[PDB]
Design a protein around this nucleic acid. Structure first.
Ligand code: EVP
Ligand code: EVP
Ligand code: MG
Ligand code: MG
Lengths: 730, 730
DNA sequence: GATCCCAGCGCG
DNA sequence: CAGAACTTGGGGAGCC
DNA sequence: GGCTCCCCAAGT
DNA sequence: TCTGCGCGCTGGGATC
């Protein structure tokens, strides 16, 4: 009572509170759908309460959070739950305003995660409820297929695709993908709320195995157990996909009672796998799927001018089949466009606007709807357009979307860092200098040894020295202008100016009860992206600090550990790495292989186009001398005699025929302007034919090692000037 | 103290509170710029407080609002203001935590409106403060022009354009339009906060004339005085624009002290005029400028599939120079796409999604970002694409944007109504039936008399009877199924089902202290868009209701008054109308004139294209017979002899030359595929040439009255089937 | 020695 | 993702 | 007989 | 227009 979002039932806390089944719904769309279904089901015994998204993990959080969490307190009040109270008897159950709890949400993985979090919360706080079938879920269809009047509902993508791949005609039906609850109309809620048999599963507790499964899924202690469990699941899925064995979808016709064991080990695990795919990047290009979609859309659009972040995000959502949320796209844009100190070393997207500074580490950026960006010319250098003809593209809803992974010239993952936070894994890879990497890979090309490389950050004046394997020390710049004055001119990585100031200066300037005052005053001269602290203190205290160490006193040093080199290899698998050299070698091997493939593809395409140009030259020369006559000629006879004259059909188009497989057409010669009959056009066409004839041999006489050199040479050719322009303005 | 958004000065309520100048800035962007300038100006004497948008009009509101208004209470606490306290002495001034108040906002009209509202507040509550120069404004430049190193700042559009039209080369400078405060970077705030002399004006009180001006601007009593004041200003502006006399911008070099009189009568009046343009629609097409921009962008895009509302709104903002706000575009889309009962009779944009129902009158619509729409085929019928060649298009920032006003076949304003709330005027025009209007205009075309017409609403089962000039009665449908049971099957216009139910049934079902219970029970059977109330009551009470009148008792009748027919005529002037017939006659006259113009334009274009086709036929016929030879021929000599042979250059392009004014080119007779030398293409070209030769005469033998007939015939031809499809599904 | 809290990012 | 004030004028219903 | 409050829409 | 919680893992700094 008194909670604004309470669409409670009539019998709330009444005589029949054991029959009042509150519906838990994440989202206002789900709340509206429940309200629409209330007309069918009535408001006497059903109450509606929305959720805020994802809930706190009580087993993983502190008691202070539990007390201070609004949503847990609200649900406890509404159900009538009591702290530490045991509910293993019906007399205590009568104290609750509601009898049963029903959960319903999207059919995607995040909904399963929400069910899992609710299960964990209930089991941790009041496990005995599970013994009485306290929880049920309202499933909703995810796919609807239409044929005339017949409508088929599919609750699982696997069974839906099984049905789809067993139809005489896919076009005989229209398929609608219900990837949410806002898509469903209020009218469909009538059908949803008219069928409890098809839309109600009950969480039937089995035994201690369910408790063990929940603990495995949610106890922070069993992280490594989660790692091995996910690895076993991944291996099983790999075996299934390499053997073609279909899996057993849980949403069966007779499926009405579900154990927590199957829910945890069958669908929440699918969410864990999806989260791992979302978060942990790929070794091949260092792009999480969201970033890959962003870049694929930016390439397809090929925008030549400024575009608003929201507009580009909407374009990404529409032409790349992104189905998670637009604000995530806005965050991805603002992350990939950041270029200040400690952020991305290479800014693929130009930050035309307030994208954040060292003051807050990108948390002070302007709103993402008044900031523009455009493709920096560097990115196209990293991913040559010609290379795209080899990438294995994907299909979502029978639409052409992003490839599995892009292919750059330089290993992108070890350039701009990687901060991925999966489930059962993680990834924290620092930055490196681009020129050092390109020199190392050029040396590797020549057969020399790869020089060991140390992490570096763009325009980072501080020095980093390795103190051990995957163990480095980051240190700022401290100077002593005069005997009782010091200057800070550099800060460690991930040490924002505002946070460092507020956490260091005044906590130590005036001090606390535990630590007295140290310094007297400080003056800051902060430029756009540089820190200049001038601190004056008592002479003796600065002498003590020098005795104690200037870096040690001011906390201008920090430890960086990189014991979590976990990436996705070329063949789509999770792999933990040890040092940079292994990743560099793997990238080198794959890049050589794709140079082999692209040389073959380029030589084939160039041969086909040279053949086409030679045919065009032959035909125009025949026309000039009058050997060919088409004036007032029938199309069929003309085509027949051209075939008999020794002309081949569409070599360029015929070239694409060999690509996809693994009457005759002469439009290309015939779709030519009459200007071609002028001598200047003839000379120009002959010139182009000869140029292509030279160029095909020039390329076929090269080697894959040769072509990489100009890739790096061109990449570095204008890398300096833009970086010079990055400093010439400043 | 304790207000979260307070960046107060150090001396807040201290010894020198008379020197603490709080800054009032609407927008978090303006707050951020103020914070950036705080570094230059120091936080000792300056405090920062942001606005919430637009503030309450204290002179026009009740005391309950004043007590319950968060903005006013917060600002009163921050300044230390006291109710009913007089501040006409320095001793009372020292009770205030702040000495001066500075106002800073955008340079557009809304900023002037915010200054006006603040002035009204201060004058109404504590006028004596104005006698002591209590208020000052911080102006910011609106246009920045760049040339190499020189930068010029312009604070007023008039002076900026005066400078612009007096330059040897506009491209010698780059112009940036600072149409906001988020555009300005923090670095520019340094320059802004370094120059008070150029960015500080003080509100110097003059006398009772200032008080009279404020009262005129803000007192609800002087609405008519505002009407005549605005009319006089409009007449003066018309005289100036017809005589070319420039106006005197107050943003002068020596301008440092400003009187409230000038502020009211030279800028805030401009905001009133702009609001009038925004709100009061146009006579010709009933589109406010926002709706016109939406339709212009929708036509240019010519989207053939569903598009998200947010995506289309962003497209509007970028390709139509809209510079107000995206949420306004979302509201405009959701308004123009609405099609339920009582809403738009004609839905130009198909509402593909939950756009709202009769339950809440469009206030229950889904999220503006989860809903799609696309151009209904009907709209293109109203605005034929060929007609667009006559509209006078506009230019913003030297970019091609929407025209002044579109020409439809039917008068659009009297079709979907008009609900505009301007300043000093208003407009409320109800709906009408399309078929009735088209029949009336067809009769007007034949010289007959225009039948008087009554307002009608699409699918509105209720009946409307006129009770006087601009005075109508709207009545629902109530029946008596049995002697003690009634059924309501229709509600008056603008009477939403939920609002009517909550305001009628339960205030009368159970009654109040003043009125006891009347009915016993009610059951509703509400379909998608129909109301079905079945009410059972005591027999004697229903007998009394029949004695008192069934419509009267249930409030199923309402009065509609249309004494505010105020529109914008073709010449862009405000005009108050009396009845529908005058508007119809004006639209009829302008539409006949534009048919005359379009007939002339079409005959000219058709003649030019027929000439071009005849030239192409002559050339190809010459080529077939060999009279013309171009094989291996020089371009220059070929062009010369073609000129001498009697061929003219680009008649279609030459046709456009005459349009814009109020060497020879032969690509069109040369840019054809070699298929043109085949006999089939020759026969086809002859067929088109002859068809155009027939068609030009067929059109030139018609009359403007004729061409309208098929416009209406085609419009009605498929008007029924879509309306039939609107009901066939239901 | 040991526990606790927080900052990094694509998501609900 | 969602929910939150005000403007500006006409006119209609509902209280005293 | 009269004052008061609210709904309508493109904007802060 | 803005502003508000939680996730999931690693590891580092502070506090006891
Ligand atoms: C908090 O920060 C600022 C707020 C504002 C106001 C504002 C102010 C409000 C308020 C709401 C609004 C809101 O308008 C609302 O938008 C909604 C957008 O979605 C649709 C569904 O419905 C719209 C509402 O019909 C409209 O009323 C803002 C949108 O555009 C604005 O200009 C509005 O309710 C409380 O007071 C201005 C600023 O600087 C100029 C700010 O910095
Ligand atoms: C109110 O209605 C609902 C809210 C939500 C949550 C949510 C919940 C919150 C909360 C915040 C949020 C918020 O996340 C924030 O997004 C921001 C988007 O712009 C940028 C600038 O910054 C992002 C924040 O980094 C992130 O924290 C929502 C955005 O997308 C969501 O899914 C979020 O703070 C309090 O609790 C889910 C629902 O159903 C699934 C709802 O019905
Ligand atoms: Mg979902
Ligand atoms: Mg503005």
């Amino acid at each position: 009572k008194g909670i604004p979002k309470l669409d409670d039932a009539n019998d709330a806390g009444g005589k029949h509170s054991l029959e009042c089944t509150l519906i838990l719904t994440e989202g206002d769309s789900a709340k509206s759908l429940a309200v629409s279904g209330l007309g069918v089901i009535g408001r006497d015994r059903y109450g509606v309460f929305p959720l805020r998204g994802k809930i706190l993990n009580v087993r993983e959080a502190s008691h202070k959070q539990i007390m201070e969490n609004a949503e847990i307190n609200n649900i406890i009040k509404i159900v009538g739950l009591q702290y530490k109270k045991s509910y293993d008897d019906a007399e205590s159950l009568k104290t609750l305003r509601y009898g049963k709890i029903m959960i319903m949400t999207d059919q995607d993985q995040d909904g399963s995660h929400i069910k899992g979090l609710l299960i964990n919360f209930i089991h941790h706080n009041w496990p005995s409820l599970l013994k009485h079938g306290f929880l049920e879920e309202f499933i909703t269809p995810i796919v609807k297929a239409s044929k005339n009047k017949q409508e088929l509902s599919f609750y699982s993508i696997p069974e839906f695709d099984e049905w789809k791949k067993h139809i005489e005609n896919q076009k005989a039906w229209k398929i609608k993908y219900y990837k949410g609850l806002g898509t469903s109309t209020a009218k469909e809620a009538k059908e949803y709320f008219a069928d409890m048999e098809r839309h109600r599963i009950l969480f039937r507790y089995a035994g201690p195995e369910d408790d063990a499964a929940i603990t495995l899924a949610f106890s922070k202690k069993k992280i490594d157990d989660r790692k091995e469990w996910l690895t076993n699941f991944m291996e099983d899925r790999r075996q299934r996909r390499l053997h073609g064995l279909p899996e057993q979808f849980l949403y069966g016709t007779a499926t009405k009672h579900l154990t927590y064991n199957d829910f945890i080990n069958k669908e929440l695990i699918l969410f864990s796998n999806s989260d791992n795919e979302r978060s942990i990047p790929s070794l091949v290009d260092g792009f999480k799927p969201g970033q890959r979609k962003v870049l694929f859309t930016c390439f397809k659009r090929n925008d030549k001018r400024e575009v608003k972040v929201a507009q580009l995000a909407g374009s990404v959502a529409e032409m790349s089949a992104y189905h998670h949320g637009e604000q995530a796209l806005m965050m991805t844009i603002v992350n990939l466009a950041q270029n200040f100190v400690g952020s991305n070393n290479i800014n693929l997207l130009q930050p035309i606007g307030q994208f954040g500074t060292r003051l807050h580490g990108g948390k002070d950026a302007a709103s993402p709807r008044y900031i523009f960006t455009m493709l920096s010319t560097l990115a196209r250098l990293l991913f040559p357009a010609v290379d795209d003809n080899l990438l294995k593209f994907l299909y979502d809803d029978n639409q052409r979307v992003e490839p599995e992974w892009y292919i750059p010239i330089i290993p992108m993952v070890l350039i701009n860092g990687a901060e991925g936070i999966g489930t059962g894994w993680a990834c924290k890879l620092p930055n490196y200098d681009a020129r050092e990497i390109v020199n190392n890979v050029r040396r590797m090309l020549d057969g020399l040894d790869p020089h060991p490389m140390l992490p570096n950050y763009k325009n980072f004046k501080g020095t980093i020295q390795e103190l051990g394997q995957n163990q480095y020390a980051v240190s700022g710049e401290i100077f002593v202008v005069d005997r009782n004055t010091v200057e800070i001119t550099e800060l460690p990585v991930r040490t924002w100016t505002q946070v460092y100031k507020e956490q260091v200066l005044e906590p130590m300037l005036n001090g606390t009860d535990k630590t007295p005052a140290l310094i007297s005053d400080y003056k800051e001269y902060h430029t756009d992206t540089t820190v200049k602290f001038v601190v004056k203190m008592t002479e003796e205290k600065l002498a003590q600090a020098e005795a104690a160490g200037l870096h040690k006193v001011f906390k201008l040093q920090t430890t960086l550990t990189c014991n979590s080199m976990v990436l996705f290899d070329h063949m789509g698998c999770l792999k933990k790495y040890e040092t940079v050299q292994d990743i560099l070698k793997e990238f080198f091997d794959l890049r050589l292989s794709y140079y082999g493939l692209r040389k073959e593809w380029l030589v084939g395409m160039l041969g086909a186009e040279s053949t086409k140009l030679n045919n065009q030259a032959r035909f125009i020369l025949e026309k000039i001398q009058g050997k060919i006559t088409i004036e007032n000629r029938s199309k069929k006879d003309l085509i027949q005699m051209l075939v008999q004259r020794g002309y081949e059909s569409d070599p360029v188009k015929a070239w694409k025929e060999a690509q996809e497989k693994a009457g005759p057409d002469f439009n290309y010669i015939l779709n030519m302007s009459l200007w071609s009959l002028t001598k200047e056009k003839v000379e120009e066409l002959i010139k182009q034919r000869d140029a292509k004839g030279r160029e095909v041999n020039d390329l076929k006489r090269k080697s894959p090692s040769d072509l990489w050199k100009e890739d790096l040479a061109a990449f570095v050719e204008e890398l300096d000037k833009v970086e010079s322009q990055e400093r010439e303005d400043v």
